[PDB]
Structure 1
Amino acid sequence: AQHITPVSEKKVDDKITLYKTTATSDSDKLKISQILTFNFIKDKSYDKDTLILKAAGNIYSGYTKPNPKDTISSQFYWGSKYNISINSDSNDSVNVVDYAPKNQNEEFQVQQTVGYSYGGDINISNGLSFSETINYKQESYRTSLDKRTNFKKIGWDVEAHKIMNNGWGPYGRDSYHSTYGNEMFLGSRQSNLNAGQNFLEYHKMPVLSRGNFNPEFIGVLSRKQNAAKKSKITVTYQREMDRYTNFWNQLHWIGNNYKDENRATHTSIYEVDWENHTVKLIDTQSKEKNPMS
């Protein structure tokens, strides 16, 4: 589906006014949904517009359940990395000027506030005039900024880092053991069960691996009031999936984890009218490289 709310206008004081529009789009097939809050700040003291864009919603992990009948080898997809990107195009006077979360973060819950001050300053503080917050869980995962970020594009990756398995670990995507391989989701080294049963219990896996990630990210963009009034914003939500496998070699079990075996993406492109504080959908596209049952 897709929907854009009418612009709503709120005075923040006598110099500052907020014009808020919320754009939504989703792909039901991929279970990715975007909820984009466009907070346009117009400050009578400052000659640039400021957009504090919050990107929230849901990205399913893409986990697939293994079949318990699988005898001496089995496999499943899991959600190993999520990427959210925002890029600005078609107006050289629009720049990404701040964002949260910043730097890198392995906290179990990322909680920050983005505040606007009279005059144009933006301040980012830890924890929960105008401000907007992000709050999201990522146990076992860690958030890092896209290392190609610049004034036209920002993004964040949330990647599996420290996965525990019944007390063993932490395991990463490329964990290595010369006997047992990558044992991140292996149930036991010597099980008599079928392969499709010899994995870590679903509920003991991280929520981000087998459930849904609920991103909350903020990009802050500025635009000079005396320059062009339209621009394009593209917001992309992606999951990358690994394939975890196990195999009985006649003496013991081994695990393997093959990185980046599939990706599913949902992308929306908006035309932003900075003068009227409005966004209009130009397109959405949903894609997935290599689905598996």
Structure 2
Amino acid sequence: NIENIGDGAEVVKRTEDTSSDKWGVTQNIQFDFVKDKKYNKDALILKMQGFINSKTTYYNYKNTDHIKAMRWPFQYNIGLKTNDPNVDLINYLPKNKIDSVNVSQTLGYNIGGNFNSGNGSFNYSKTISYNQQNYISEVEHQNSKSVQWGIKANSFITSLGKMSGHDPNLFVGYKPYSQNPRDYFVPDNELPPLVHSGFNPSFIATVSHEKGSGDTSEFEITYGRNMDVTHATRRTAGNSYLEGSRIHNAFVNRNYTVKYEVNWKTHEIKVKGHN
């Protein structure tokens, strides 16, 4: 679909969808080519959406009756890179450390290659919107060829008051005598959506390409998680309770990576490969 955005400019919209049962990921990518006569560069707006399954599991610790485990996502990973020397990452959203429950931001474009991370005054716009209850979003790394976000366990309200994402007693349950590993941890109504279900990413990246320097560019988009393990141990003025201990970053970069090829002249998208 083509959208006129004013005098001598239009936007060509394309979409690519890929899922992985191996990683528990759906990448829904929107590629919006900005074709403007008044802008000396080819420009692409990437809206990265979809789903990253939390893959939260509860299992018994070995051959014990009293140590049970919760493997859960400490952090979600969102990354974008290019290997094209003619392509520059010019902007991305969210840009700064944000801890609000809902992250809702707008990228605005104006004829002449003017991008603003602030609608109606613009010729074109794209909006990101995602929930990250109890998590914080931040840029882990960035350069002219890449941007990487971390959406990590941050602040939680528990039965023992406020807890950090690093507290070993985080998510520890109320049933020390149950044989069900799920019972050793707080119920789903006490867990944030990012733990019980997964993450619905909504991220933006704008890339610029030098006019007539090459018809194609490759982009690698990575969606994943880093898993923590919480062990809940039964402890025994004769009552029993549960105590947590943590293996932080027990499983890092459990990521689904997809390589996309973009054609700047034809506006066609191809999935080159994936893991």
TM-score over 0.5 (shorter chain): yes
Q: Deviations over 1:134-153 (max 9, x none)?
A: 0000010000002x310000
Q: Report the AA paired with residue 218 of structure 1.
A: I
* 8 A contact 2:15–2:29 mirrored in 1: yes
Deviation of the 1:210 alpha carbon:
1.8
1:165 aligned to 2:151?
no
Aligned residue for 1:235?
A: 221
Deviation of the 1:255 alpha carbon:
0.5
Deviation of the 1:213 alpha carbon:
0.5
Q: Choose from 212, 217, 227 the match for 2:198.
A: 212
1:123 aligned to 2:112?
no
SS at match of 1:281: strand
Aligned residue for 1:291?
A: none
Question: What's the % identity of the aligned pairs?
Answer: 29
More moved, 196-205 vs 219-228: 196-205
* 8 A contact 1:70–1:195 mirrored in 2: no
> Where does 1:82-101 land on structure 2 (aligned, <5 Å)?
82-89=76-83, 91-101=84-94
Aligned residue for 2:232?
A: 246
More moved, 150-159 vs 227-236: 227-236
Deviation of the 1:71 alpha carbon:
2.8
Aligned residue for 1:143?
A: 137
Q: Deviations over 1:250-277 (max 9, x none)?
A: 3753201211222421111012211222
CA distance in 2, matches of 1:49, 1:225: 6
Aligned residue for 1:261?
A: 250
TM-score by length of 2: 0.90
CA distance in 2, matches of 1:36, 1:23: 5
* 8 A contact 1:112–1:124 mirrored in 2: yes
Q: Report the AA paired with residue 51 of structure 1.
A: L
Deviation of the 1:222 alpha carbon:
0.4
Deviation of the 1:123 alpha carbon:
0.5
CA distance in 2, matches of 1:219, 1:160: 24
Aligned residue for 1:55?
A: 48
Q: Report the AA paired with residue 279 of structure 1.
A: I
* 8 A contact 2:258–2:273 mirrored in 1: yes
CA distance in 2, matches of 1:101, 1:171: 22
Q: Report the AA paired with residue 267 of structure 1.
A: T
RMSD of aligned alpha carbons:
2.1
CA distance in 1, matches of 2:134, 2:107: 25
* 8 A contact 2:176–2:234 mirrored in 1: no
Deviation of the 1:185 alpha carbon:
1.1
Q: Deviations over 1:143-181 (max 9, x none)?
A: 0002x31000011110000122236222322x2xxxxxx
* 8 A contact 1:79–1:210 mirrored in 2: no
SS at match of 2:30: strand
Q: Choose from 253, 261, 264 the match for 1:271.
A: 261
SS at match of 1:223: strand
Aligned residue for 1:225?
A: 211
* 8 A contact 1:62–1:239 mirrored in 2: no
Q: Report the AA paired with residue 260 of structure 1.
A: N
Gaps of 5+ in 1: 1-7, 176-181, 286-293
Q: Report the AA paired with residue 9 of structure 1.
A: I
More moved, 191-200 vs 18-27: 191-200
Aligned residue for 1:103?
A: 96
CA distance in 2, matches of 1:203, 1:65: 16
1:153 aligned to 2:146?
yes
Deviation of the 1:96 alpha carbon:
0.2
